Amino acid sequence: DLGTENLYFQSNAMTYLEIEGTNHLSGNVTISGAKNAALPLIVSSILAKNEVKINNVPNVADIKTLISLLENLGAKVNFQNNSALLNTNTLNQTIAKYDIVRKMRASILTLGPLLARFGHCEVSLPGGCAIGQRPIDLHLLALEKMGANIQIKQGYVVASGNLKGNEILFDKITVTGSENIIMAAALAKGKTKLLNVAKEPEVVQLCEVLKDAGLEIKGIGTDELEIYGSDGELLEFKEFSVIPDRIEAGTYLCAGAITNSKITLDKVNATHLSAVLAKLHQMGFETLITEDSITLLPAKEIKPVEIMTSEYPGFPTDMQAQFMALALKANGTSIIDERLFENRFMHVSELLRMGADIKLNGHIATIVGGKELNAADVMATDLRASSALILAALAAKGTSKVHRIYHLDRGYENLEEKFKDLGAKITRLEE
Amino acid sequence: NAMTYLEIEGTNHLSGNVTISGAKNAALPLIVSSILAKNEVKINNVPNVADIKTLISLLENLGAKVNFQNNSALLNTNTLNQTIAKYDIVRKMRASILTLGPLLARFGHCEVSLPGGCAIGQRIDLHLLALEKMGANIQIKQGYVVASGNLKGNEILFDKITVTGSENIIMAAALAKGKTKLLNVAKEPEVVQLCEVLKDAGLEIKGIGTDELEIYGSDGELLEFKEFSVIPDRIEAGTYLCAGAITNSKITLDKVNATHLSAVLAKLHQMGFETLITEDSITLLPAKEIKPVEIMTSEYPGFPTDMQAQFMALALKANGTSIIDERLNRFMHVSELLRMGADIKLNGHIATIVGGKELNAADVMATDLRASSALILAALAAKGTSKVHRIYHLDRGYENLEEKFKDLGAKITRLEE
Ligand SMILES: [Cl-]
Numbered sequence: 001d002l003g004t005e006n007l008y009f010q011s012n013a014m015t016y017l018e019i020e021g022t023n024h025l026s027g028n029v030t031i032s033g034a035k036n037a038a039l040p041l042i043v044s045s046i047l048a049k050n051e052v053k054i055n056n057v058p059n060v061a062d063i064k065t066l067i068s069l070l071e072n073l074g075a076k077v078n079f080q081n082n083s084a085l086l087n088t089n090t091l092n093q094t095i096a097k098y099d100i101v102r103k104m105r106a107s108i109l110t111l112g113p114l115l116a117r118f119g120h121c122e123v124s125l126p127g128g129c130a131i132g133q134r135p136i137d138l139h140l141l142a143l144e145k146m147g148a149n150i151q152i153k154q155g156y157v158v159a160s161g162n163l164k165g166n167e168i169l170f171d172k173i174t175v176t177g178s179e180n181i182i183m184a185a186a187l188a189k190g191k192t193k194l195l196n197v198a199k200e201p202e203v204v205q206l207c208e209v210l211k212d213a214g215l216e217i218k219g220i221g222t223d224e225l226e227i228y229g230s231d232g233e234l235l236e237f238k239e240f241s242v243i244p245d246r247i248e249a250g251t252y253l254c255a256g257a258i259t260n261s262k263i264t265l266d267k268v269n270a271t272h273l274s275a276v277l278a279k280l281h282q283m284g285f286e287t288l289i290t291e292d293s294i295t296l297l298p299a300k301e302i303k304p305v306e307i308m309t310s311e312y313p314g315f316p317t318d319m320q321a322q323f324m325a326l327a328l329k330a331n332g333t334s335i336i337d338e339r340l341f342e343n344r345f346m347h348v349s350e351l352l353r354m355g356a357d358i359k360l361n362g363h364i365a366t367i368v369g370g371k372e373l374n375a376a377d378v379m380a381t382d383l384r385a386s387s388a389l390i391l392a393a394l395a396a397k398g399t400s401k402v403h404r405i406y407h408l409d410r411g412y413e414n415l416e417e418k419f420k421d422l423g424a425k426i427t428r429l430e431e
Numbered sequence: 432n433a434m435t436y437l438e439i440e441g442t443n444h445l446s447g448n449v450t451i452s453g454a455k456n457a458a459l460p461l462i463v464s465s466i467l468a469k470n471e472v473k474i475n476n477v478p479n480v481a482d483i484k485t486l487i488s489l490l491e492n493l494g495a496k497v498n499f500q501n502n503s504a505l506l507n508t509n510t511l512n513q514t515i516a517k518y519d520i521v522r523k524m525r526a527s528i529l530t531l532g533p534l535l536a537r538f539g540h541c542e543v544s545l546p547g548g549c550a551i552g553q554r555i556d557l558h559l560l561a562l563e564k565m566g567a568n569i570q571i572k573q574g575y576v577v578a579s580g581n582l583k584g585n586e587i588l589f590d591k592i593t594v595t596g597s598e599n600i601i602m603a604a605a606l607a608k609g610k611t612k613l614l615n616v617a618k619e620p621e622v623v624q625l626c627e628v629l630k631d632a633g634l635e636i637k638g639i640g641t642d643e644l645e646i647y648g649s650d651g652e653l654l655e656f657k658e659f660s661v662i663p664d665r666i667e668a669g670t671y672l673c674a675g676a677i678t679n680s681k682i683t684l685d686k687v688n689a690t691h692l693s694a695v696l697a698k699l700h701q702m703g704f705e706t707l708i709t710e711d712s713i714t715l716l717p718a719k720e721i722k723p724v725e726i727m728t729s730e731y732p733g734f735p736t737d738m739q740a741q742f743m744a745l746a747l748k749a750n751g752t753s754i755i756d757e758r759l760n761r762f763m764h765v766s767e768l769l770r771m772g773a774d775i776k777l778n779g780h781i782a783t784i785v786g787g788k789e790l791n792a793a794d795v796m797a798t799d800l801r802a803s804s805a806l807i808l809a810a811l812a813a814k815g816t817s818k819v820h821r822i823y824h825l826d827r828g829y830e831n832l833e834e835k836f837k838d839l840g841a842k843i844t845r846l847e848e
Contacts, residue, residue, distance in 0.1 A: 006553070006571050009570055108551045127522050132823035136550070343555070346590045349564075360615045361615075363591070
């Protein structure tokens with residue numbers, strides 16, 4: 001999911017965003033291709049005997065890193081105008097100790113395809129693996145069910161053996177684990193049956209592409225897949241476009257709502273935002289869909305909302321912060337119920353400095369909307385929190401300053417240009 | 432000194448007493464807290480496990496004079512010198528980040544290795560943001576944290592309930608300049624003991640046991656510690672209770688605090704097992720029929736996620752359908768129970784157990800401590816002789832685990848793999 005280290009804290013070379021508030025918005029914003037779909041779709045070219053064409057690919061750091069890793073392993077690549085060309089005919093793995101760190105982070109997606117196609121694969125134990133403990137993120141248990149022999153012998157995890165189909169149960173709903181095992185099953189011998197499979201549109205596209213490429217797969221879109229493996233034979237890929245970034249789209253919608261403004265989104269799929277559109281409706285905003293486009297209409301009054309995060313197709317945790325920001329304008333008390341898994345409320349402290357009335361009680365945030373928000377100097381954290389602070393700034397009185405935008409820039413390309421075209425008064429300055 | 436495994440015969444019935452050890456998760460922060468003591472600190476009822484020894488040895492490497500025998504430790508950090516703590520025994524230790532707070536606060540800077548911990552993908556760490564709010568300058572070069580600056584009191588909000596974050600910031604606030612206010616603080620008994628010890632040692636602290644603490648920092652002045660015993664290990668206790676329940680047997684636990692297991696005792700009651708408390712001891716009585724249970728994990732004092740697996744194992748003997756609702760892995764033990772004939776179905780984050788079916792013995796691979804506990808329990812109730820491999824997480828969590836089950840009557844034996 002993430003392609004580099006904790007460079008967030010390195011604030012010697014850095015920039016920040018200055019945003020003036022209380023400006024009505026207007027116009028159109030084109031939604032980019034989903035970063036989380038593109039990553040597994042690029043890793044999937046490991047399964048293609050021919051040239052793979054992929055369109056609507058966001059030009060972000062993680063995409064570039066992945067492409068460069070495949071080049072280092074022999075793949076012939078090209079990437080321009082959000083379109084990539086992949087050919088893994090010459091792909092070969094390198095000696096366990098070559099591109100060490102790059103291969104360790106990408107192993108959550110590449111481990112499966114590489115072990116399946118090439119019969120073996122080595123990944124380095126991260127720092128923090130006490131004698132014995134194997135990485136639980138890799139789905140090592142899953143691959144063992146498919147006949148893989150796994151061992152820890154020189155500071156690395158060494159997987160080997162020919163993969164065969166089997167019934168595999170996911171201990172928890174995992175987007176990357178699903179994608180990693182879907183690609184392993186694709187080349188294994190015989191039929192694989194996956195249970196408790198993530199239903200996210202990103203997983204669905206992966207399956208659709210493989211199906212379109214000749215693989216027998218049933219249950220697409222459900223939590224239970226049946227895959228008839230090609231028994232080592234690579235597939236004939238066909239050109240396709242990466243799906244629109246539903247989170248990015250959700251965030252532009254909240255920008256239109258929090259400023260209580262008419263705006264329109266292009267190159268967007270409403271079917272992937274069901275839960276989000278329903279909540280915007282619960283808050284008084286009418287939605288209007290015309291295939292690849294969505295238009296948001298202002299509300300008479302912004303009404304409070306109750307949100308509980310869950311796995312797709314429920315309300316996405318990746319939109320929780322943007323809705324907390326919008327709930328600040330609602331005429332009444334809102335409630336947001338989150339999962340105690342990876343902070344998730346990093347944006348709260350910074351909103352308090354903008355005069356927000358927010359109280360945390362364990363995993364549940366109570367928002368008392370109505371107060372006028374005041375501008376402030378805020379420190380952004382993850383992508384999620386970063387989106388929320390920009391939204392709050394657009395509705396607050398005065399000029400705000402959003403610092404530490406490292407996670408935001410690695411998540412979205414031309415972010416200023418899009419807000420600028422919608423009429424927002426945003427400018428980047430040197431820290 | 433190679434890998435070993437456990438061979439367990441499906442027991443018909445247990446009986447006797449089991450003494451509960453001191454909580455490893457309390458002991459770790461309490462040992463790190465001697466960094467805040469100007470004199471000798473005495474700590475009793477300390478479990479003899481790998482993480483305890485490693486931590487003691489880390490403090491020795493930094494200058495502290497130490498000793499550890501018969502579950503009792505002596506700590507004196509009068510000679511604690513440098514705050515450079517970047518070794519590999521420390522890198523692998525998950526609880527080592529607990530030292531960052533005390534060392535930065537007392538000495539003005541420190542270097543510690545990022546724990547990580549087998550995960551490929553990592554977090555922004557919540558400890559680091561918290562210390563920045565207290566004026567600290569943080570930087571990451573290589574896989575180490577370089578912290579510096581003088582700490583000052585401030586109002587700090589925890590983005591999520593975190594046991595170690597709380598402990599780490601409670602110790603930092605203790606020596607910082609001025610008043611600190613902590614919000615959304617974990618209420619676990621482990622955090623509570625830390626606060627009690629510091630209060631007893633002369634620190635002005637209010638709200639102990641609640642989710643909101645108020646700390647008046649001693650502005651660099653160290654505290655006078657008083658001798659104490661680490662609290663009993665509530666998870667270990669919960670696990671011996673499930674052993675007694677899954678074998679539907681009368682057993683008793685000693686050196687245990689029932690107040691720290693209220694949610695767990697309530698569920699055992701919901702399943703037909705009578706509980707009987709007498710001072711520091713609990714006695715479990717068999718049920719006429721084991722009844723199904725509905726469990727939802729939550730923050731203390733609710734049902735602990737650290738007992739969820741042991742209850743899934745017990746639900747296999749219940750006459751009916753049970754439900755366990757978890758936080759999004761936490762169900763790594765499910766696959767191995769299926770090979771013992773269990774009827775368990777996962778639907779996202781909710782497991783449905785259809786108890787009643789007879790469990791059969793099997794050759795299983797344990798994973799984390801949680802899963803490891805569950806497999807031993809299932810083995811005791813299954814028919815035949817099971818074999819539980821990969822017990823490295825179990826041995827680092829409990830000492831003389833065989834000896835305790837043996838004394839309760841279980842047929843368990845350790846063999847070389
Ligand atoms: Cl108090």
